[PDB]
Copies of this chain bind each other. A is one copy, B any other.
Amino acid sequence: VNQHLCGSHLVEALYLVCGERGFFYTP
C-alpha cells in the first residue's frame, strides 16, 4: 500500500528525469 503510492511518485519522477528519452515501468 505504501509501495503503491510510492510507485505513483516514481513514475512522475521518471517522467521528468527521463524526458524525451522515455521509460518503461515495471514493479
Contacts and interface: CB of A to CB of B under 8 A. Distances in A.
A2 B6 contact: yes
Copies of this polypeptide in the complex: 6
Contact of A20 (B15, B23, B27): B27
A2 to B, nearest CB: 7
Interface residues of A, number: 24
Interface in A1-27: 1-2, 4-9, 11-20, 22-27
Given A11-B25, A22-B24, A25-B25, 13 more contacts: A2-B2, A2-B6, A4-B9, A5-B5, A7-B15, A8-B9, A8-B15, A14-B25, A15-B25, A16-B16, A20-B27, A23-B24, A24-B24
